[PDB]
Amino acid sequence: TRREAIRVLGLLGALDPYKHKVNIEMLVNMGNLPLDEFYPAVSMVALMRIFRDQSLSHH
Protein backbone atom coordinates (compact mmCIF):
# COMPACT_ATOMS: atom_id res chain seq x y z
CA THR A 1 0.00 0.00 0.00
CA ARG A 2 2.82 2.41 0.84
CA ARG A 3 4.60 1.50 -2.40
CA GLU A 4 1.40 2.24 -4.31
CA ALA A 5 1.11 5.59 -2.52
CA ILE A 6 4.66 6.34 -3.66
CA ARG A 7 3.65 5.40 -7.20
CA VAL A 8 0.66 7.76 -6.97
CA LEU A 9 2.82 10.64 -5.74
CA GLY A 10 5.33 10.07 -8.53
CA LEU A 11 2.55 9.89 -11.12
CA LEU A 12 1.07 13.19 -9.92
CA GLY A 13 4.34 14.89 -10.91
CA ALA A 14 6.74 17.34 -9.33
CA LEU A 15 5.69 20.39 -7.32
CA ASP A 16 7.25 23.53 -5.86
CA PRO A 17 6.72 23.56 -2.06
CA TYR A 18 6.45 27.35 -2.35
CA LYS A 19 3.58 26.95 -4.82
CA HIS A 20 2.14 24.32 -2.47
CA LYS A 21 2.15 26.53 0.62
CA VAL A 22 1.16 29.78 -1.12
CA ASN A 23 -1.83 28.32 -2.97
CA ILE A 24 -3.23 26.16 -0.13
CA GLU A 25 2.72 29.38 27.14
CA MET A 26 4.49 28.76 30.44
CA LEU A 27 7.84 30.46 29.77
CA VAL A 28 6.18 33.56 28.30
CA ASN A 29 4.06 33.85 31.44
CA MET A 30 6.88 33.20 33.91
CA GLY A 31 9.01 35.98 32.43
CA ASN A 32 6.52 38.57 33.75
CA LEU A 33 4.46 36.92 36.54
CA PRO A 34 5.51 36.03 40.09
CA LEU A 35 5.53 32.25 40.36
CA ASP A 36 3.36 32.25 43.50
CA GLU A 37 0.47 33.39 41.28
CA PHE A 38 1.50 31.59 38.08
CA TYR A 39 1.83 28.05 39.42
CA PRO A 40 -1.66 28.01 40.99
CA ALA A 41 -2.75 29.21 37.53
CA VAL A 42 -0.89 26.20 36.09
CA SER A 43 -2.53 23.75 38.48
CA MET A 44 -5.86 25.29 37.50
CA VAL A 45 -5.02 24.96 33.79
CA ALA A 46 -4.21 21.26 34.19
CA LEU A 47 -7.32 20.75 36.34
CA MET A 48 -9.49 22.40 33.67
CA ARG A 49 -7.87 20.39 30.88
CA ILE A 50 -8.91 17.25 32.74
CA PHE A 51 -12.26 18.78 33.78
CA ARG A 52 -13.52 19.36 30.23
CA ASP A 53 -12.75 15.74 29.22
CA GLN A 54 -14.99 12.72 29.78
CA SER A 55 -12.45 11.15 32.18
CA LEU A 56 -13.73 13.56 34.86
CA SER A 57 -16.63 11.13 35.31
CA HIS A 58 -14.05 8.58 36.55
CA HIS A 59 -11.95 10.99 38.67
Added chain:
Amino acid sequence: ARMAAAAAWGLSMEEYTCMIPRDTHDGAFYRALALHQDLFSLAQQCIDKARDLLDAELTAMAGESYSRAYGAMVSCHMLSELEEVIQYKLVPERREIIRQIWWERLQGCQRIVEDWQKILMVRSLVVSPHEDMRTWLKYASLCGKSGRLALAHKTLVLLLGVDPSRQLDHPLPTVHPQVTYAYMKNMWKSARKIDAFQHMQHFVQTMQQQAQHAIATEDQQHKQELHKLMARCFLKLGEWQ
Protein backbone atom coordinates in the same frame (compact mmCIF):
# COMPACT_ATOMS: atom_id res chain seq x y z
CA ALA B 1 31.84 4.50 -9.31
CA ARG B 2 28.58 6.35 -8.68
CA MET B 3 29.93 9.67 -9.98
CA ALA B 4 31.33 7.82 -12.99
CA ALA B 5 27.87 6.33 -13.58
CA ALA B 6 26.27 9.78 -13.38
CA ALA B 7 28.34 10.77 -16.44
CA ALA B 8 28.17 7.33 -18.07
CA TRP B 9 24.40 7.72 -18.39
CA GLY B 10 25.37 10.09 -21.20
CA LEU B 11 28.12 7.79 -22.54
CA SER B 12 30.78 2.44 -19.13
CA MET B 13 27.55 1.97 -17.19
CA GLU B 14 27.95 -1.83 -17.15
CA GLU B 15 31.31 -1.33 -15.39
CA TYR B 16 30.34 1.49 -13.03
CA THR B 17 27.17 -0.11 -11.66
CA CYS B 18 29.23 -2.89 -10.04
CA MET B 19 30.64 -0.43 -7.46
CA ILE B 20 27.20 0.85 -6.33
CA PRO B 21 25.52 -1.17 -3.53
CA ARG B 22 21.99 -2.45 -4.15
CA ASP B 23 20.79 -1.14 -0.76
CA THR B 24 20.73 2.50 -1.97
CA HIS B 25 18.11 3.87 -4.37
CA ASP B 26 20.89 4.95 -6.73
CA GLY B 27 21.79 1.27 -7.05
CA ALA B 28 18.36 0.37 -8.40
CA PHE B 29 18.14 3.63 -10.35
CA TYR B 30 21.39 3.02 -12.25
CA ARG B 31 20.72 -0.70 -12.62
CA ALA B 32 17.63 0.55 -14.47
CA LEU B 33 21.48 -0.03 -17.04
CA ALA B 34 18.48 -2.29 -17.58
CA LEU B 35 16.85 0.49 -19.63
CA HIS B 36 19.99 0.87 -21.74
CA GLN B 37 19.77 -2.91 -22.22
CA ASP B 38 15.96 -3.13 -22.71
CA LEU B 39 15.71 -5.47 -19.70
CA PHE B 40 12.16 -4.52 -18.78
CA SER B 41 11.53 -7.38 -16.34
CA LEU B 42 14.61 -6.44 -14.28
CA ALA B 43 13.68 -2.77 -14.67
CA GLN B 44 10.30 -3.20 -12.95
CA GLN B 45 11.93 -5.11 -10.09
CA CYS B 46 14.56 -2.40 -9.62
CA ILE B 47 11.88 0.31 -9.73
CA ASP B 48 9.83 -1.42 -7.03
CA LYS B 49 12.90 -1.96 -4.85
CA ALA B 50 13.75 1.72 -5.31
CA ARG B 51 10.23 2.56 -4.16
CA ASP B 52 10.91 0.50 -1.03
CA LEU B 53 14.15 2.34 -0.31
CA LEU B 54 12.53 5.71 -1.01
CA ASP B 55 9.76 4.68 1.39
CA ALA B 56 12.46 4.17 4.01
CA GLU B 57 13.82 7.65 3.24
CA LEU B 58 10.39 9.32 3.08
CA THR B 59 9.34 8.02 6.49
CA ALA B 60 12.38 9.95 7.79
CA MET B 61 11.98 13.14 5.73
CA ALA B 62 8.30 13.34 6.74
CA GLY B 63 9.36 14.81 10.09
CA GLU B 64 10.74 18.16 8.94
CA SER B 65 7.40 19.67 7.87
CA TYR B 66 7.84 17.88 4.51
CA SER B 67 10.33 20.54 3.38
CA ARG B 68 13.34 18.32 2.69
CA ALA B 69 10.86 15.71 1.43
CA TYR B 70 10.82 17.62 -1.88
CA GLY B 71 14.12 15.93 -2.70
CA ALA B 72 12.69 12.49 -2.02
CA MET B 73 9.50 13.61 -3.76
CA VAL B 74 11.54 14.29 -6.90
CA SER B 75 12.83 10.72 -6.69
CA CYS B 76 9.22 9.50 -6.78
CA HIS B 77 8.72 11.47 -9.99
CA MET B 78 11.97 10.03 -11.35
CA LEU B 79 10.82 6.50 -10.58
CA SER B 80 7.45 6.98 -12.26
CA GLU B 81 9.07 8.18 -15.46
CA LEU B 82 11.16 5.00 -15.52
CA GLU B 83 7.93 3.04 -15.95
CA GLU B 84 6.93 5.50 -18.64
CA VAL B 85 10.15 4.70 -20.48
CA ILE B 86 9.26 1.01 -20.21
CA GLN B 87 5.96 1.91 -21.86
CA TYR B 88 7.47 4.48 -24.23
CA LYS B 89 9.45 1.98 -26.31
CA LEU B 90 7.08 -0.92 -25.68
CA VAL B 91 3.81 0.66 -26.88
CA PRO B 92 4.22 3.10 -29.82
CA GLU B 93 0.62 4.26 -29.41
CA ARG B 94 1.02 5.68 -25.88
CA ARG B 95 4.34 7.26 -26.91
CA GLU B 96 2.78 10.46 -28.30
CA ILE B 97 0.91 10.98 -25.03
CA ILE B 98 3.81 10.01 -22.75
CA ARG B 99 5.74 12.94 -24.21
CA GLN B 100 2.86 15.30 -23.32
CA ILE B 101 2.59 13.81 -19.82
CA TRP B 102 6.33 14.28 -19.32
CA TRP B 103 5.94 17.92 -20.38
CA GLU B 104 3.08 18.49 -17.93
CA ARG B 105 5.05 16.84 -15.12
CA LEU B 106 8.10 18.99 -15.85
CA GLN B 107 6.04 22.19 -15.65
CA GLY B 108 5.58 21.62 -11.90
CA CYS B 109 9.17 20.98 -10.83
CA GLN B 110 11.20 23.75 -9.20
CA ARG B 111 13.38 25.76 -11.57
CA ILE B 112 16.65 24.10 -10.52
CA VAL B 113 19.24 23.02 -13.08
CA GLU B 114 20.44 19.80 -11.44
CA ASP B 115 17.03 18.19 -10.89
CA TRP B 116 16.02 19.27 -14.40
CA GLN B 117 19.12 17.63 -15.87
CA LYS B 118 18.38 14.44 -13.94
CA ILE B 119 14.85 14.44 -15.38
CA LEU B 120 16.11 14.71 -18.95
CA MET B 121 18.91 12.27 -18.11
CA VAL B 122 16.15 9.73 -17.57
CA ARG B 123 14.05 10.87 -20.53
CA SER B 124 16.83 11.04 -23.15
CA LEU B 125 17.16 7.23 -23.31
CA VAL B 126 14.33 7.19 -25.85
CA VAL B 127 13.94 10.79 -27.14
CA SER B 128 16.95 12.36 -28.80
CA PRO B 129 17.66 15.72 -27.07
CA HIS B 130 17.58 17.70 -30.33
CA GLU B 131 13.98 16.57 -30.96
CA ASP B 132 12.50 18.13 -27.80
CA MET B 133 13.57 21.66 -28.65
CA ARG B 134 10.84 23.36 -26.58
CA THR B 135 12.20 21.71 -23.44
CA TRP B 136 15.73 22.95 -24.14
CA LEU B 137 14.35 26.43 -24.86
CA LYS B 138 12.90 26.31 -21.35
CA TYR B 139 16.32 25.09 -20.18
CA ALA B 140 17.76 28.25 -21.73
CA SER B 141 15.06 30.30 -19.97
CA LEU B 142 16.00 28.77 -16.59
CA CYS B 143 18.62 31.51 -16.10
CA GLY B 144 20.43 34.28 -17.92
CA LYS B 145 23.45 31.99 -18.35
CA SER B 146 21.40 28.78 -17.88
CA GLY B 147 23.55 28.36 -14.76
CA ARG B 148 26.80 29.11 -16.62
CA LEU B 149 27.87 30.14 -20.12
CA ALA B 150 29.25 26.67 -20.86
CA LEU B 151 25.78 25.18 -20.33
CA ALA B 152 24.19 27.86 -22.53
CA HIS B 153 26.81 27.16 -25.20
CA LYS B 154 26.08 23.42 -25.09
CA THR B 155 22.33 24.05 -25.27
CA LEU B 156 22.84 26.30 -28.28
CA VAL B 157 25.11 23.71 -29.91
CA LEU B 158 22.43 21.05 -29.43
CA LEU B 159 19.54 23.15 -30.75
CA LEU B 160 21.54 24.66 -33.62
CA GLY B 161 23.65 21.77 -34.80
CA VAL B 162 26.27 24.53 -35.13
CA ASP B 163 29.45 25.06 -33.09
CA PRO B 164 29.98 28.77 -32.21
CA SER B 165 33.35 27.84 -30.67
CA ARG B 166 34.45 27.28 -34.30
CA GLN B 167 31.59 29.05 -36.13
CA LEU B 168 30.99 32.35 -34.31
CA ASP B 169 31.86 34.20 -37.54
CA HIS B 170 29.36 32.03 -39.43
CA PRO B 171 26.19 33.78 -40.69
CA LEU B 172 22.84 33.10 -39.11
CA PRO B 173 21.88 29.41 -38.79
CA THR B 174 19.30 27.38 -40.69
CA VAL B 175 17.79 26.38 -37.33
CA HIS B 176 14.14 27.07 -36.53
CA PRO B 177 13.80 30.90 -36.12
CA GLN B 178 13.11 30.72 -32.36
CA VAL B 179 16.52 29.18 -31.67
CA THR B 180 18.13 31.82 -33.89
CA TYR B 181 16.51 34.49 -31.72
CA ALA B 182 17.69 32.69 -28.57
CA TYR B 183 21.24 32.36 -29.91
CA MET B 184 21.38 36.06 -30.71
CA LYS B 185 20.07 36.93 -27.25
CA ASN B 186 22.92 34.80 -25.91
CA MET B 187 25.44 36.62 -28.11
CA TRP B 188 24.10 39.95 -26.81
CA LYS B 189 24.93 38.65 -23.31
CA SER B 190 28.65 38.94 -24.04
CA ALA B 191 31.19 41.43 -25.35
CA ARG B 192 29.88 41.15 -28.93
CA LYS B 193 26.81 43.33 -28.42
CA ILE B 194 27.25 45.29 -31.67
CA ASP B 195 27.63 42.08 -33.67
CA ALA B 196 24.54 40.75 -31.91
CA PHE B 197 22.61 43.83 -33.08
CA GLN B 198 23.85 43.36 -36.65
CA HIS B 199 22.86 39.69 -36.51
CA MET B 200 19.45 40.81 -35.26
CA GLN B 201 19.13 43.06 -38.31
CA HIS B 202 20.16 40.14 -40.52
CA PHE B 203 17.59 37.91 -38.81
CA VAL B 204 14.83 40.46 -39.35
CA GLN B 205 15.84 40.73 -43.02
CA THR B 206 15.76 36.98 -43.63
CA MET B 207 12.52 36.57 -41.66
CA GLN B 208 11.01 39.28 -43.87
CA GLN B 209 12.15 37.19 -46.84
CA GLN B 210 10.55 34.12 -45.24
CA ALA B 211 7.32 36.04 -44.58
CA GLN B 212 7.24 37.11 -48.23
CA HIS B 213 7.63 33.44 -49.14
CA ALA B 214 5.02 32.59 -46.49
CA ILE B 215 2.23 34.70 -48.03
CA ALA B 216 -0.26 31.84 -48.29
CA THR B 217 -2.83 29.95 -46.24
CA GLU B 218 -0.86 26.70 -46.09
CA ASP B 219 2.11 28.39 -44.34
CA GLN B 220 0.27 31.11 -42.39
CA GLN B 221 0.90 29.16 -39.18
CA HIS B 222 4.58 29.94 -39.67
CA LYS B 223 3.84 33.50 -40.81
CA GLN B 224 1.78 34.34 -37.72
CA GLU B 225 4.50 32.84 -35.52
CA LEU B 226 7.06 34.65 -37.65
CA HIS B 227 5.29 37.96 -36.97
CA LYS B 228 5.80 37.43 -33.24
CA LEU B 229 9.48 36.71 -33.74
CA MET B 230 9.85 39.67 -36.08
CA ALA B 231 8.06 41.76 -33.47
CA ARG B 232 10.43 40.56 -30.75
CA CYS B 233 13.42 41.20 -32.98
CA PHE B 234 12.14 44.65 -33.89
CA LEU B 235 11.64 45.41 -30.21
CA LYS B 236 15.22 44.36 -29.55
CA LEU B 237 16.41 46.34 -32.58
CA GLY B 238 15.04 49.33 -30.74
CA GLU B 239 16.40 48.68 -27.27
CA TRP B 240 19.71 47.17 -28.37
CA GLN B 241 20.24 50.16 -30.66
